[PDB]
Amino acid sequence: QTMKGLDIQKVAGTWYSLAMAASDISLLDAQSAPLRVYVEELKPTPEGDLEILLQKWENGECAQKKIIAEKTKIPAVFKIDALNENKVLVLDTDYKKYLLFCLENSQSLACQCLVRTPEVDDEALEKFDKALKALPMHIRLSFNPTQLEEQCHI
Amino acid sequence: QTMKGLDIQKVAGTWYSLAMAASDISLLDAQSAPLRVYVEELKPTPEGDLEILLQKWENGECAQKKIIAEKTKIPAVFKIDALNENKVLVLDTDYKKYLLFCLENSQSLACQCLVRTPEVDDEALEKFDKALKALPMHIRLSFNPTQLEEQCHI
Numbered sequence: 163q164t165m166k167g168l169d170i171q172k173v174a175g176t177w178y179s180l181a182m183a184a185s186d187i188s189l190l191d192a193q194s195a196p197l198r199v200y201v202e203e204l205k206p207t208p209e210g211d212l213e214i215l216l217q218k219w220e221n222g223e224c225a226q227k228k229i230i231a232e233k234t235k236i237p238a239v240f241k242i243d244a245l246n247e248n249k250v251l252v253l254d255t256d257y258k259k260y261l262l263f264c265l266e267n268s269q270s271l272a273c274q275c276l277v278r279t280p281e282v283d284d285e286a287l288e289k290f291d292k293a294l295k296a297l298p299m300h301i302r303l304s305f306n307p308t309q310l311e312e313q314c315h316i
Numbered sequence: 317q318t319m320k321g322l323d324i325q326k327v328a329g330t331w332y333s334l335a336m337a338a339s340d341i342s343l344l345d346a347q348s349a350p351l352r353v354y355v356e357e358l359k360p361t362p363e364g365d366l367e368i369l370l371q372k373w374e375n376g377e378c379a380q381k382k383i384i385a386e387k388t389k390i391p392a393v394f395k396i397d398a399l400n401e402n403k404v405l406v407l408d409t410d411y412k413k414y415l416l417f418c419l420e421n422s423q424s425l426a427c428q429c430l431v432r433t434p435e436v437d438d439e440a441l442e443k444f445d446k447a448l449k450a451l452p453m454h455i456r457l458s459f460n461p462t463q464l465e466e467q468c469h470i
């Protein structure tokens with residue numbers, strides 16, 4: 163599932179990680195689990211790369227991180243340069259309310275439901291759950307509006 | 317949601333904790349989270365109480381535990397004696413394949429999908445997810461057949 167006709171410039175700005183799901187419990191279990199990452203801001207570049215500002219709990223504190231996802235020939239697919247080739251996939255967005263994405267290796271998967279506002283969007287969560295229905299996810303987390311306004315959703 | 321016409325004697329024997337969900341991430345997050353409990357065996361007593369054999373990861377090892385849930389005037393509701401009054405609710409069972417239950421305080425909630433066999437029962441999981449749809453759950457875990465045959469689902 164990919165977003166046809168994605169305009170990456172229109173995903174700019176503030177986002178909340180309302181929900182997260184992953185193929186492996188260990189990817190999301192603890193506050194310090196590897197893919198327990200809280201999106202803050204998406205900053206698409208003029209050349210169409212994607213800078214991601216996020217928070218991650220590591221070494222007993224809520225740390226700031228900056229990821230750059232490089233564009234590919236497919237608008238809805240980005241690459242993160244590391245020891246491993248990992249793909250960022252944009253499944254679905256309306257730009258103004260929700261965005262669904264997955265991070266996949268070469269498989270392990272973590273996906274999130276991003277929303278624009280610190281509110282539980284049952285409709286976005288329905289799109290999120292329907293997107294994942296056939297994906298092999300074994301852990302799903304969702305956050306309340308109080309948590310969404312805290313550093314690392316504490 | 318309670319099981320009408322529950323015969324507690326018919327839930328005896330081997331069960332697998334195929335899936336678990338809870339109101340609070342912290343109840344299920346880590347292997348050592350309080351309600352990360354793996355059912356082994358249900359042993360109803362002649363007088364209609366329920367002994368539960370389970371495993372729980374505590375102090376760096378998979379520990380054996382025995383819980384007794386006392387019957388109430390409602391067949392599908394049991395009480396666990398502690399500092400807190402906690403209710404065990406039997407939502408649904410066919411005795412031969414699946415059983416859904418919740419543990420609730422006075423609220424925080426943890427629920428499980430129990431199955432008779434180390435197999436992913438998509439139908440039981442559908443009943444589980446439909447039962448929880450309006451419950452305020454923020455963490456959901458499910459286990460693969462390999463994990464289901466390991467002590468504490470490692």
Ligand SMILES: CCCCNc1ccc(C(=O)OCCN(C)C)cc1
Pocket residue numbers: 173197199201204212214216229231242244248250251252261263265
């Ligand atoms: C619209 C796309 C949003 C993408 N958001 C994110 C993309 C990646 C990550 C992320 O945490 O990536 C780290 C994994 N690397 C090191 C392989 C977190 C959020």
Ligand SMILES: CCCCNc1ccc(C(=O)OCCN(C)C)cc1
Pocket residue numbers: 327351353355358366368370383385396398402404405406415417419
């Ligand atoms: C058919 C009913 C099955 C009930 N199964 C279980 C019931 C209770 C627990 C359980 O872990 O209870 C501990 C909580 N106490 C100390 C308040 C675990 C499993």
